[model samples]
Target: DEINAQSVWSEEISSNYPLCIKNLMEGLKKNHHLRYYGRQQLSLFLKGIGLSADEALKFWSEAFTRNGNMTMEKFNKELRYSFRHNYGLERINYKPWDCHTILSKPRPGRGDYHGCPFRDWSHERLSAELRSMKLTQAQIISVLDSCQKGEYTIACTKVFEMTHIAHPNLYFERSRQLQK
Candidate 1:
């Protein structure tokens, strides 16, 4: 099988992929309400995808400030600091969390959106997300059924085989290639 990592996390994805990570990354593009962990996951992946702190700062601020709720000042004082820190400017350059690490983490509470979608997301939500991806009709059914049967990692694999992926970056990269 061919797998490509996210070498370039820009407008045109030039690398490879995760399902949950993919959804969250795109979700963050809009003005969504992501909790602390969700924000951390997105920021973590972006940093690992090779987006510099300047681009990260600009990307995050633009996404958040699309609405009236978050001000640029708020992002700088609180959010901006974490972005730079993750890039290791202020500390160790931490790698992005893998599937196991993210899956082993606690389930998301209300207003939270960080865990794997196959395991934590409601069936309806997961179904909608898969459908949104334009997956094959039968494949979507199989993936949803796997989730219901408690095969979390397997369901994720089905997404890849069919399509983490744990590395959302890779998923994006692969998906871009596949989509083309």
Candidate 2:
């Protein structure tokens, strides 16, 4: 079956397109905690229509060729960057589940859910907390800098040791097997 641009976005948007766009713009504007969650939600929504990022870019490119209003190239480039960092959409410590629920029962917060599990790991506010806990700014920045540049195990190791001292249960063993 042949699909056009309107059909593609229409089918993908389905019922939640407005919310999707709103969430996406929210991420773009505020760099809010919703960015990653919004992207993940949009990703899943697009997948439902058999559209991947690459495919969506291709479609938008074609649309631009026809109309010149939608610059898929520019948009796609940003999308690539957005997808590059795991925490690009939102800051590292957005706790959706724990914050929403009055009681913290489930093993909540991580990946797709809400809640700021890495609450103390944030470069901004977390740095203050880390200082309170006696971790120097240099120490925290060094760890965060390494984590930013694709050094996951070492960064996670530092973060765990620095932030999870009180909660030993939060320790995660270094894994070379995890894919980027």
Candidate 3:
């Protein structure tokens, strides 16, 4: 019975925390395809939002197993170690990165999906996507101005405020608070 239960997150997550949500989606539905940094970013974000290490293990385990491509030994040794590291069980407790760090971390290469959309997404796409999210043109202009000035996280802050939210964790908790 547990086999069919979905481990997926919500659309609320997709709307507010776009980076983490998109990375999770691309990794899961597209055959578990995030690169190294991509997984770390997603892992840290998941850790921040209260996914304990073992639960995270199962969360990733179920998704990758759909295609029968990943195995217990590899997943345990590599991914399990990684999750615990994020949680501090491996001795270095890492904090989830704020928007600035995530924004500056690396350029999204081919097939990479873990970048801040304001920085990584082409303006046309960001423009359309943000509009589709129901933010007004006036608010979106403020967003574009920041990005044009290379102030992407500032744009992120406003998008989350006008829509962290400098951090994905901040956005997630804030969304939770408002939802409650």
Candidate 4:
């Protein structure tokens, strides 16, 4: 019953949006494990991408209904309020998670995926991913060196420079920029 909610996003939006927002959209689309903080980040990213409260309400409503297999009534009763609360329609608004905060937070446990990939993933896996991205051997070595030093942010920044893309959306934009 899971649906790919990421598909609802137009290519234009995905192409130009921030990396974090793209990650959130992919996580939602893939039905990836996302905890409270991740959920908060996703909601905030959606807002950052110009989804107004009403638009978000409809978007999330339909997405959850389709992907979560929840009835509209059930969603209204259990989840709608929280969505509004996240938008600051109630209580205080929470800020989006920054890279440092994300890296410093407790690591994601089994069945969770809320941490920085560079920090959380095995070195072998990270290296493989970098290789797949076609990073030069020297760049891969440099990134791994940063990881060995426990410099997760620096490793990611290296990735940004080497790949010419900081996040998912930028990956596309930067690729195009590089090509031209």
User: Which candidate tops lDDT?
Assistant: 3
Q: Rate residue 62 of model 1 by lDDT.
A: 71
What is residue 120's positional error in candidate 3, in angstroms? 1.3
Question: 10-38, model 2: which lDDT tens digit per residue?
Answer: 53332222212322333333331233454
lDDT of 2 at 68: 51
- RMSD (Å) per prediction: 4.8, 17.0, 4.0, 5.4
Residue pairs of candidate 4 with colliding backbone atoms: none
Model 4, span 10-29: residue lDDT tens = 66335443334455566655
TM-score of 3: 0.79
Q: Show model 4 residue runs off by greater than 4 Å.
A: 1-23, 165-180
Off by over 4 Å in 2: 1-5, 11-34, 59-77, 81-180
**Candidate 1 C-alpha lDDT tens digits along 1-180:** 121123333434532346666656666655444667887787777666567766776666776676665878987777777766777667575777777778777888765568788888777787787776567779888998888898877787777776424556555555666767
Runs of candidate 3 with Cα error greater than 4 angstroms are 1-8, 12-24, 67-78, 88-90, 162-165
Superposed by TM-score, candidate 3 places the C-alpha of residue 102 at a distance from the truth, in angstroms, of: 1.1
lDDT of 3 by residue, 36-110 (tens): 777778878877777777677677776665576677777776676665666677666678777777877888877
TM-scores, each model vs. reference: 0.77, 0.26, 0.79, 0.70
Candidates arranged by TM-score, highest first: 3, 1, 4, 2
Specify the highest-TM-score model's number. 3
Better of 3 and 4 by TM-score: 3
Candidate order by lDDT, decreasing, is 3, 1, 4, 2
Give candidate 3's whole-model lDDT: 0.69
User: Global CA lDDT of candidate 4, please?
Assistant: 0.63
